[PDB]
Design an enzyme around this catalytic site. Structure first.
Site, PDB file in Angstrom:
ATOM      1  N   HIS A   1       0.885  -1.175   0.000  1.00 11.56           N
ATOM      2  CA  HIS A   1       0.000   0.000   0.000  1.00 11.56           C
ATOM      3  C   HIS A   1       0.929   1.233   0.000  1.00 11.56           C
ATOM      4  O   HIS A   1       1.395   1.670   1.045  1.00 11.56           O
ATOM      5  CB  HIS A   1      -0.945   0.010   1.199  1.00 11.56           C
TER       6      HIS A   1
ATOM      7  N   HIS B   1       1.921   4.984  -2.697  1.00 13.88           N
ATOM      8  CA  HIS B   1       1.511   5.903  -3.749  1.00 13.88           C
ATOM      9  C   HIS B   1       2.738   6.545  -4.373  1.00 13.88           C
ATOM     10  O   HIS B   1       3.697   6.848  -3.665  1.00 13.88           O
ATOM     11  CB  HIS B   1       0.623   7.017  -3.199  1.00 13.88           C
TER      12      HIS B   1
ATOM     13  N   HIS C   1      -9.230   1.046   2.247  1.00 17.15           N
ATOM     14  CA  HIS C   1      -9.061   2.072   3.255  1.00 17.15           C
ATOM     15  C   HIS C   1     -10.193   1.867   4.281  1.00 17.15           C
ATOM     16  O   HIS C   1     -11.336   1.732   3.890  1.00 17.15           O
ATOM     17  CB  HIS C   1      -9.136   3.455   2.580  1.00 17.15           C
TER      18      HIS C   1
ATOM     19  N   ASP D   1      -4.204   1.538  12.489  1.00 16.68           N
ATOM     20  CA  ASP D   1      -4.796   2.712  13.117  1.00 16.68           C
ATOM     21  C   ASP D   1      -5.578   2.343  14.371  1.00 16.68           C
ATOM     22  O   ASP D   1      -5.889   3.288  15.122  1.00 16.68           O
ATOM     23  CB  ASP D   1      -5.654   3.449  12.120  1.00 16.68           C
TER      24      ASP D   1
ATOM     25  N   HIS E   1       0.300   1.906   7.965  1.00 15.69           N
ATOM     26  CA  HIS E   1       0.501   3.254   8.480  1.00 15.69           C
ATOM     27  C   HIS E   1       1.637   3.354   9.447  1.00 15.69           C
ATOM     28  O   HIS E   1       1.690   4.269  10.261  1.00 15.69           O
ATOM     29  CB  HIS E   1      -0.769   3.831   9.109  1.00 15.69           C
TER      30      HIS E   1
ATOM     31  N   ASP F   1       2.334   3.460   3.312  1.00 14.22           N
ATOM     32  CA  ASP F   1       1.377   4.433   2.759  1.00 14.22           C
ATOM     33  C   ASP F   1       2.055   5.747   2.467  1.00 14.22           C
ATOM     34  O   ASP F   1       1.555   6.852   2.735  1.00 14.22           O
ATOM     35  CB  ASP F   1       0.137   4.633   3.633  1.00 14.22           C
TER      36      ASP F   1
ATOM     37  N   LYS G   1      -8.792  -0.902  -5.432  1.00 18.48           N
ATOM     38  CA  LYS G   1      -8.830  -0.175  -4.142  1.00 18.48           C
ATOM     39  C   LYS G   1     -10.206   0.427  -3.944  1.00 18.48           C
ATOM     40  O   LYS G   1     -10.812   1.019  -4.823  1.00 18.48           O
ATOM     41  CB  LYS G   1      -7.751   0.991  -4.260  1.00 18.48           C
TER      42      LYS G   1
ATOM     43  N   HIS H   1      -5.177   0.066   6.513  1.00 21.99           N
ATOM     44  CA  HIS H   1      -5.068   1.041   7.614  1.00 21.99           C
ATOM     45  C   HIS H   1      -5.403   0.398   8.951  1.00 21.99           C
ATOM     46  O   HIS H   1      -5.774   1.077   9.908  1.00 21.99           O
ATOM     47  CB  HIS H   1      -5.840   2.314   7.396  1.00 21.99           C
TER      48      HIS H   1
HETATM   49 ZN   LIG Z   1      -6.122   5.524   2.776  1.00 25.62          ZN
HETATM   50 ZN   LIG Z   2      -3.050   5.165   0.652  1.00 20.90          ZN
END
Ligand SMILES: [Zn+2]
Ligand SMILES: [Zn+2]
Ligand SMILES: [Zn+2]
Ligand SMILES: [Zn+2]
EC number: 3.1.8.1
Lengths: 330, 330
Positions: A21, A23, A167, A199, A220, A267, A135, A196
């Site tokens: 995950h 970008h 997400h 979290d 994360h 991420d 996604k 995620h």
């Molecule tokens: Zn996200």
């Molecule tokens: Zn992301």
């Protein structure tokens, strides 16, 4: 079988250490092309991405999964450029995140299924680049449109073997509703990563999903506003739990027997336009290692806590390949 | 002394009969390139637009102003292609409509001003095609972001002489707040068209704006769901007033002495993805003349009602040139 990347299909043997995950650029559809100067320039953004991918490669990364959708401003020609320059495999995504424009949010579940299928089976835009993952997103209880997106994503996965990654608002246990919707479509949990997930501190929630066969995306890990707590925008994005607390969830899932269910990532990104203007700079201040944070900081931390290297190789090499290689049941 | 088009600068004389609020395709940023099959194909859309533009040209149209912004999915390469094939001038727009993505909605007034100026002074994307109008929108009282957009639009107009044109909810009298915001920035009303103004029967709202020097955009003339009132989506878009009712507002403003303030158009399009899937087909059933509706139907109707052809030429030729030719005060 083979995993589609922006340079073409690759075999399982070729994927290597994979961040699931990530970008290249977190933006909006059309935005990089219309306003490249937001990023300094397109050239500057590409250069930054190449440096960071090379950094990651030097730390052992071989593949990233760029989970940017249409509405994150995914520019697969940028992905291809930087993949080639850095010699890092990049898997592109289809799906929808939580900024769909009117032309997407007015569409039916059948229309959305057709779009996701186009991007997997035919290609993205006129590039020929095929998506290797889907996604989707919720932020609490799914909206009506997000329910259609989840169902379309399940249908596209069932037609292609391409997995789904999500997400979540983890502290609100969104993974349970996502799972329920997916299973109501007949999707195998082995084709889904609930992202995620670091979290939350609710280990019961995570282990129960893992026992159902979901992949648990602990993506994360470097997110923390410790040292900048009164930066409201950064605090909202990053939280105030430490990276160590997040990393210890990896250990907790290992210790409870769920190593095969874990996917880890950062991420990270190299450009970021969908939030406060200079969030990228603040993030780079928080985590100067960028995408190399997992291999350079998290793996040694977990080794120091007693996790064997073979377990960590299973998580970072074996699990991503099993997740990405197309199938209806892994 | 020149107006920017998708084929470069043109003179006022070259502009000729001008439709001041039109679209080639009403979409969303990135959408036409990501999902051209929504429109059949990109080729099918372009062919449809060329046929329609050729028919409009045969009816006397020489220029259209395509008021599609970034967030309407403006594709200036498509506009350039169809402009060439049909031999109709097309003015492109900057600004923002009411579907901005996060990367726009998070921006400051200064950043938006820079973006609109880039599109006017430098070019759109990497095309070199410069905008000749700024489009903005409200639907009732402006949101905080729409206030920034209006202010940035006024600032870009004050720096360049390019005019501003607006979407309103005319029933809500939005033109009054838009005017107030524009004047608070020092923008001359002679640089502003308050659009969709034929959506109301409240002549006093229109005359009071015209008396202040605003241009009044009577740009919804063919919009009517008469004969299809049971189609809820079409009725919401089109209303239940006749085209003749809308057209008679042109005469009413002429009779009061405001002919110089009137701009007329169709708000037509050749593709439409930001609403119900087949709205384009419903619209084409309502108005088979498309962009030729103004010259073929409305002009002869107003002549039959006693308006001199010379007044109508002033409205369709003289007023658009005075509006478009760059200046800070017309
Ligand atoms: Zn996200
Ligand atoms: Zn992301
Ligand atoms: Zn409008
Ligand atoms: Zn319009």
């Amino acid at each position: 079988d083979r995993i589609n990347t922006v340079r073409g299909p690759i075999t399982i043997s070729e994927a290597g250490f994979t961040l699931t995950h990530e970008h290249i650029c977190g933006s909006s559809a059309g935005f990089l092309r219309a306003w490249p100067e937001f990023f300094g320039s397109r050239k500057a953004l590409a250069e930054k991405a190449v440096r960071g991918l090379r950094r990651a490669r030097a730390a052992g990364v071989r593949t990233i999964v760029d989970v940017s959708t249409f509405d994150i401003g995914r520019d697969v020609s940028l992905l291809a450029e930087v993949s080639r320059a850095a010699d890092v495999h990049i898997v592109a995504a289809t799906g929808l995140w939580f900024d769909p424009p009117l032309s997407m949010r007015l569409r039916s579940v059948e229309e959305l299924t057709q779009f996701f299928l186009r991007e997997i089976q035919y290609g993205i835009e006129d590039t020929g680049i095929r998506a290797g993952i889907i996604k989707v997103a919720t932020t609490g209880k799914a909206t009506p449109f997000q329910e259609l997106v989840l169902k379309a994503a399940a249908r596209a996965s069932l037609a292609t073997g391409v997995p789904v990654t999500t997400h979540t608002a983890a502290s609100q246990r969104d993974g349970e509703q996502q799972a329920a919707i997916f299973e109501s479509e007949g999707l195998s949990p082995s084709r889904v990563c609930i992202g995620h997930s670091d979290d939350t501190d609710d280990l019961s929630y995570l282990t129960a999903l893992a026992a159902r066969g979901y992949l648990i995306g602990l993506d994360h890990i470097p997110y923390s506003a410790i040292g900048l707590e009164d930066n409201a925008s950064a605090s909202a994005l990053l939280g105030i739990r430490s990276w160590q607390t997040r990393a210890l969830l990896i250990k907790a899932l290992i210790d409870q027997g769920y190593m095969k269910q874990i996917l880890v990532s950062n991420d990270w990104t190299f450009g970021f336009s969908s939030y406060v203007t200079n969030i990228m700079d603040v993030m780079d201040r928080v985590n100067p290692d960028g995408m190399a944070f997992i291999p350079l900081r998290v793996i040694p931390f977990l080794r120091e806590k007693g996790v064997p290297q073979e377990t960590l190789a299973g998580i970072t090499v074996t699990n991503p390949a099993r997740f990405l290689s197309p199938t209806l049941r892994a």
